Amino acid sequence: IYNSFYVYCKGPCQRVQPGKLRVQCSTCRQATLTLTQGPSCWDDVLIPNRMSGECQSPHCPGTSAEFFFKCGAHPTSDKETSVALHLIATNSRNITCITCTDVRSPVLVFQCNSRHVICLDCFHLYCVTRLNDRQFVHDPQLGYSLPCVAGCPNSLIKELHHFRILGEEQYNRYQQYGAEECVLQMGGVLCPRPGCGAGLLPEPDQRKVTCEFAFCRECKEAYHEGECSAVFEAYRVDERAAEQARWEKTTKPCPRCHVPVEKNGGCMHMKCPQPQCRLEWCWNCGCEWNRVCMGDHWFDV
Amino acid sequence: IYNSFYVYCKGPCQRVQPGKLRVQCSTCRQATLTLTQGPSCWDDVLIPNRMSGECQSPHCPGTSAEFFFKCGAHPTSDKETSVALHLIATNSRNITCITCTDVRSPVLVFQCNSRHVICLDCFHLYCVTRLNDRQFVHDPQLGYSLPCVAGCPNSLIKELHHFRILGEEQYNRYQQYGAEECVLQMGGVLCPRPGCGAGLLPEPDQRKVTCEFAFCRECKEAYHEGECSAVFEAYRVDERAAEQARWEKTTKPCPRCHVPVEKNGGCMHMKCPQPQCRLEWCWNCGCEWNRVCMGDHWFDV
Amino acid sequence: IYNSFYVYCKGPCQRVQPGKLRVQCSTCRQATLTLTQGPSCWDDVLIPNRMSGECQSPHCPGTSAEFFFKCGAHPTSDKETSVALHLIATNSRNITCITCTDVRSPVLVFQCNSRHVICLDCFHLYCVTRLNDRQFVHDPQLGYSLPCVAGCPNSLIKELHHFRILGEEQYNRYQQYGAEECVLQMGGVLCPRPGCGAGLLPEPDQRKVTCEFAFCRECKEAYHEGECSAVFEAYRVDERAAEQARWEKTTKPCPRCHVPVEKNGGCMHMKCPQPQCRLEWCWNCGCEWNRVCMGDHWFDV
Amino acid sequence: IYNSFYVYCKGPCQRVQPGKLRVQCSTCRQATLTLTQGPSCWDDVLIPNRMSGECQSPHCPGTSAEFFFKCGAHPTSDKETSVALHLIATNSRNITCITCTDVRSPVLVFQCNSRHVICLDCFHLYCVTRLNDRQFVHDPQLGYSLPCVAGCPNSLIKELHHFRILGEEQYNRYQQYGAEECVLQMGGVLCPRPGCGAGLLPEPDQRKVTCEFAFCRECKEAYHEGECSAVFEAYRVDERAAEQARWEKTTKPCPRCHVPVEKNGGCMHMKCPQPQCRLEWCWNCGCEWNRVCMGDHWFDV
C-alpha cells in the first residue's frame, strides 16, 4: 500500500503512524463535501479555506473544505484527529540516512537546499541528545527548534509537533525549554517529574538533587550511581553519507483509453478528458479513483 | 545478524531493542571471567551463581559468573544495563501474529501450552486496552499481570518489565494499579499526572474532573470534547489465526574437520572433540567462536 | 490486480477479457441500487431477482438488483455489455493445464468431479478440432456442446457462449452445427462463407467443391493443394498431467480492529461487527470496501 | 527459448504465433539444401534466390535456397506455411509500449526513425479504430495501410499481412477498403457479412439498414439499440511514453577454444576459425549449432 501521510498518534499508539486524510464541509462539519478538485500539496490541506467544493448536505450552502488526519492503525472516534508531520515521507527511492547510512522507511526530509533525509530512529536520537545537552535553537516567533543535522542554513523545523518523536516524557521537558534555560543560567535545576514542575537550588558541586524525587542533575533522570548515558557526554557529518542522503508538464496515458492526461502538481486524482471515456483514476495505482486512494495518498510531494 | 536477546532500553531509546549479553566475575566485577562452559538457557544468565568459570584478574579467586545485558543501538556507559525481556524473540520461522496475522519480528511468545506469538504492536495495544479497561489480573505474589490474549491457563506473564512496552506514561499508571483500583471502587478518581498522584472525588455524573490538571474520567487523558478513543470502549480470538500463531541428541559436523559435535541445549558455543582440530565455533554462524556471537546470540531458546 | 470475472468481448477485443461486474436497479435501470448484501456466488448475479437492495433514485420503489458485466480493457458505452464466462478463472494456485502441463492464467475449469483445468490456448484447439472432426455432443435441451477433455461424466458445458473462444468464423459454423450435420449425412456439403449459407452437392470422390467460393470439403476452408491442417486428421489423456490439473466457518480478523469477521460464501465484502469500528473491507485486499473491489472481484468462487 | 520469428497462423490458431524458419532446395523442393552461409537479415529469407548452397539430393543440381515459415504451436502438414510478420519481435530490452506504457512481448516495431514499439493488443485496437473510422492511408502501389501511431513520416507498413491482427471478420472488411470507400462517398452502405458483399442505399437519416441482415450503419455490426462501441466515437501521443518506447566488428569468443569469432550481421550461426577447434555454434545460446537454433532464431534483427 502507498502512504503519503504520517501523523503523530498520541494514543493509543504514542508514535508516528501512517495517517488517513479526511475532508468535511467547513460550515456543517459533515463528510458531505465533494471537492471541485483535489489537494495537490501540503498548503492545500493545512491552510484554512484553501480549497472549494460542493456540500451535498440538505440545506447547507457550505462551499469550503476542511481537512484533517486520523491515525490508521486502529479504529478512531469521530473527532480523534492527529497532527500531520509533513516532513515525514515514504522512502520510495531508498535514500540512505544521513547519519546511519541505512535505508529505512519512513524518513524525515529536512527543508535544507540538499533535502537531507534522516531515518526516524536517528532523528529521535538527534532530538534527545540536543535536548539533554541544551543545544536547541531559539527562534522568537516559533520557539525552540533544530535545523538539519548537517547544520545547513534555513533548515529550522517549523512544525514543532515533529518533536513529539522525543517521547511523552522528553516532550514535556522540551515544552519547558525556555523556563528551564532560565533556571539553569541562575545555577538552579528543574524537577523533571511532570506534576511537580518545581524549581530547585542545590550546591554546584553536588550532582544528586532531591525534590518533593531523587534525580540526577546532568541527566535529569532518576539518580544513578556512576556515569550518565554515553550518548549524553556533550555534530560532525560524514561527507559521503550526507551526499548519499539527498532527496532527489507531466502526463500519463489513461489506463482505460490511453489518451495522455495531465497531472496537477502532487495530486493523485487524474481525470481523463476523452469524452467517451472520462475515467477518473489514481496516478499511482492505475485503478479508478476511490476512497482508499483518497485517504492514503490523495496527493504526494 | 542474529539477535537472540531483546531488552527494554529506558533511555535514550525508550523502547524494545536488541541487546548485548555480557559477563563479569561476580567477586571483582571485572570482565575477566572465562566461562567453563557457556550459558544454554535463560536460567543460566538470570539466576545468580548458576554458572562457574575462571577469573583472569591478578589476585582474584572469583569463580562465579554474573551476567547482564546492554542496549546495542548506541554507546553505553559501564553500568548502563537494561532488563532482558526473555519472552521476546526473533521470528525466524515467520510465525503469524495471533491477533493481526502479519509476520513481524521480533515477537512475544506467551508461556501457554500453544506458545502463541504476538507482534509487539499488538502486544502494546493489548496492554493499553486492558489497563484502561481495568482488566489486569491480580496475582498476590507477582502483582498485576496479563495472560495470553487467547486466555490460555497458566500463561500469566511473570517478568513484569515486559509491561514497559506500555510506554513511560502508561507504565507509571500500571505501577499504581493496586492503589487506583482502590480509589475507583470508592467511586473516586486518581490524577494521571505522575508528580501529582493526588486522589480526587467528583460527582458520579460528571466525566470532567479537575486537579492541582484538566482530565477525562473514563480515559484518564487530558479532557476531551466528545468521545474517548475508539479502542477504549470496553477478547475473542480468531480460531484460525490462533492455530497459525503457534511457536513450533542434536549434532552438527565441525565446519573445519566435519566430525559430529554435540550441541548443549540452546548454547551456540560448539567445541570440536577432534584432537587435531579442536575448533571452537558458533552453531548458528559456522565461524570460529568470538565476542560478537557471544554478545549477540550466546544461546537461543 | 485481482480479477474474478472474465467475459467474451465481441468487439473491439474479439476475445476473452477480464470483466467488470455492475449492478443497477431492475425497475428504473439506474446505477442507484445499494445491495443489502453483496453477491456470494455465480447464481446471485446470473439468476434474475436473486438479490435485494435499496434504490436511491428519487421516486423509484425498486428493490431488486440486476447485474451485468462489461469488458474492462477499454471504454464502454452505457449498454455495451458482455457475457460472463463463469468457467474461466484466475489461476492463483498455479494449476498445470491438463493437456499442455504449462501453468497459464486464466484457465477454464470443467464441472467434472475432478475439476480439471485447461488453459485457453488448449481449450481453443480442443473446440476447433472437435468442431472440424464433427465430435460435438448433442444435448436436446442445450444444443451442441463438449464435456471435459478427459471425458468425465456430467461435465457437459452448459453456458454455450464459452464456445465463442472458437473465433468469429468457427463460431458461426458451430451455430450451424445441427443443420450441417443433416447436410453431411445426406452426403452434401455446406458452404462455409457466412453470407452464403448455401447447401451444395458434389461427387463423393472430389474434395474440391465450388459455390456462389472455392473451398475444401474436409477442412471447410479455402481449397488447398495437398493436405488439410495436421490437427484435423481425425482424445487420450496423460494420466499424470490429468491428476496434476485438478482444481483443489471461515473468518479473518478485521484489518482495523482485529475482531474475527465471518465471510459469506465467496463474497469479498466483509463487515466488521465491532460497534466502535464497523469497518467495511475486502477479504482479498485488506483495504476498506470500494468500487474497484466491487467491479473486479465482488465475489470469487 | 529464443524466438526471432513471428507468423500469422490462419488456422487452427487464427492469431500471431512464434514461427519456425525452414529451408529447401528451390529446384527439387526437398529439405536437402545445406547453406553455404546462413541468413543474416530479413532480405536473405524474403527475397527469392538471395542465398546459395548445396543440395544433397541424388541427381539434383539445385544451388538456390527457398525459405518458408511454419506456425510452431502445433503439428503442421508439409505445405502448411504461414506468412512472416517481420515487424514483430521479442521484447528483450523490455521497451514500454508507446500507447499503454506496459512492457509486453512480443511487440511490433514501426519503421519510423525512432523505431517506436507498440504491444500487439494496442496495435490491434489501433487498426480496428482506424478501420471503423475510415482513417487508413491510401498508397497507390501498396494499397491501404497505416503509419506509426505517432504519425511519423516514412513509417507506412509495407507488408500488409500485419493487418491480419484485425481478426478474420475485420480483415475481410479491410480487404474491401477501396470498394467500401466508393460506396460511402455516394452515401451508400456495404453489407458487412462476407458472403453477401451487397451494396445498399438507405436514407441518410436512418442508422438501421437491412440486407439479404440487420446491421448498424456507423458501426457495421449487428444493429444495436443505443450507441456504438465507445472506441468508435471518432491520435495524440503522450510525449514521455513515446520517448520511452524507442527501440535502441562484433565478435565473441568461441565457447570451446575462446578464440574471438566475428559475427555476420544478425546471423546466429558462428564458425570458429581455429583449425584444431572449428566449433560451429549459436551466438545466442553458446551451444553447438543445431536444428533448434536454426528453426527458432537462425538470425535476429
Added chain:
Amino acid sequence: IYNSFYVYCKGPCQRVQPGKLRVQCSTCRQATLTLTQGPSCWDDVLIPNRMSGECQSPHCPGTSAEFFFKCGAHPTSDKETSVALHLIATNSRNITCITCTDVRSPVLVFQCNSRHVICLDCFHLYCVTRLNDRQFVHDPQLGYSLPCVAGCPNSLIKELHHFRILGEEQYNRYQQYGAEECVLQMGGVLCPRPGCGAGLLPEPDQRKVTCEFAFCRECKEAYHEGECSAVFEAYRVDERAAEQARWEKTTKPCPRCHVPVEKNGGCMHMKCPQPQCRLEWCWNCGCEWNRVCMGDHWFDV
C-alpha cells in the same frame, strides 16, 4: 545447461569435467552410426555391443554401436577420450553432502542402499586420508578400493578411475598400493617420487629417510620439521547429515501435439507416436531432438 555425464580429463584439465557422449560404428570407427533406439542407462554405453543401429557409411555393414566420452571444456583431438565416472551426477535435488552438509554440484553417489551423496571436495579428502592412513579395502578381483564413508555394506567402488580424484601424485601412489603394503609390513619404506620407485630400509626410530630425495616416513611428502598434516593423524558419521544426504509407466505429453509419450528408462530421446506429428524431442528440454541433447544428456540415471 543439463550435464548427465562427468569424466576425468587427464590433460589439459587434470580434473573432473562435464563430458560429451559420442557414438560411432564399431566396425568402421566412423561417426555414421544412427541408433535404432538411444541408450537408457550406463550399461547401454559401457558394455560392448549392447546397442544396435545402422551405419550410413558407403560399404559398411556395421550394425553395432561403440560409445565413448570426451572432455567438453576445450577442443579435443579425434581420439582424445576420457573415462566416464558414472557415480558422479548433477545435484538437481540439492541433496546435502553426507560429510559437510553443504549443497554442492556435481556430487558422487555411493551404491549403498541409502544412496548417500558426497561432494567432490569431501570425496577427495576421504580418499587422501584413507590412502595416507593405509585404510583402503582389498578386493582380490578389483584391487584396492573404498566403500561409502558411512561404512555401508555392498558399497565398494568398482570403477577405480574414480580414484583419479586423488590427484596425479597421490594416484600413482594408490596404483602402488599392494606393493607398498608389502614394503611397510617388513618395516620398509617406499620412495614417493614416481621415477624412483625404490624400496628403502631405515631404522624404525627415525622419521626422516633419504633416497636417490629427502622425505618424511609417515607423511610420504618432502621431509618436514615438526608434525605431519593435521588431517593425517589417524570415520564417524553425523546421524542427521547422513539421513539428509540420501539420493531420493512414466509419460509426458508431446510438446507439439500433446499426446502422452512413454519414456524409456533414463533415455531422454522421446518419439511421438501421433502419425500427423511424429515429433522427436528431449524429455528434459522440451525441444526437438538434436546433437546437443545427445552429447550432454542422452540419458540420465
Added chain:
Amino acid sequence: IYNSFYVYCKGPCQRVQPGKLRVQCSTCRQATLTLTQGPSCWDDVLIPNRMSGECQSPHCPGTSAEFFFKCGAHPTSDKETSVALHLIATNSRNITCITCTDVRSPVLVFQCNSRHVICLDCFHLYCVTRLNDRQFVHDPQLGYSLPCVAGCPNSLIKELHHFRILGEEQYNRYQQYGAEECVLQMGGVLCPRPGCGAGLLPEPDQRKVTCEFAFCRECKEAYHEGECSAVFEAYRVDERAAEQARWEKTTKPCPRCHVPVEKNGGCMHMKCPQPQCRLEWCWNCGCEWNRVCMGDHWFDV
C-alpha cells in the same frame, strides 16, 4: 563470508584455497603479538618487519610482527603454512573473465595498467599451453614467467608460486624450464617422469621416445597413437571481452555512535575516535572487531 586471501595448499587440497592470515611475535614465535595498527596492504604482511606491536609473552621484548597464511579448508598443524597468491581476489564486482567472458570467483588480476582479470580455469589453461608450447618469458632475475594474456607491457608475474596452478606434474616440469630449454635446443628430449630427470637423444624424425618410460616427444605425456591434445597445437584477445575484464579520505560512520571514521588504506580494522564510544569494528562486516575478520579479511586490496 568475505575472503580477501587465497593460498596454494600443497596438501591435502593440492589447489587454490581461501586462506587464514595469522600473526606472531617474530622473536619468540608465539601468537602473543598485538598489533599497534593492522596491515593495510600486501607489503605489510609480505615484507619482513614492516609492522610493529607488543608481545604479551612473559619475558619477551619482541616488538616486530611476523605474518603467515594457512589453508582454511581443514585443520592445520602448527607450522602447516601455505604461500599467499596475492594476485588472486574475490570477484565482488562481477568482472567478466578476459578469455571466457564468464563471471567467476575467485579471479587472478594481472598487474598490467588495465588490471585485466582472468578466471582460474582460464589461467590454468593459459599456463599449461604456454608451458607445452615453450612460450614462457625468461627474466634473468626472476626466472621463467608469463605476462598478461593480452600481452600488456610490465605485467610479468613476479610471485612464481602462482604457477602452482599448473598442477603437481606440470609444475615440476616448469621448475626444469631452463634445463629443458637447453636439452631441446640441442635436439634432445627430457624424460618427463619426476624421479628420472634423464636427458635423452632420439632421431629428429621419430616422435616416440623411450627411457628408463614410453612417452611422446611433442606432448611429453605417455606415448599416444595419433595426435596430441587439441590445445597443444601451437594469443589473440577479443577486444570487447578485454575491455569488459578490467578491474575498476574514505570514511564511514561508526556502527554504534555514527561519528565518521577514517579508513587506513585497505585495512578493515576501524577505530572509533569518539571517547564515549571507542568501538573497534570491521569496515566490511559492520560488527565489532574480532578474530574471524582478522583471519578472513584483515585488509583487502
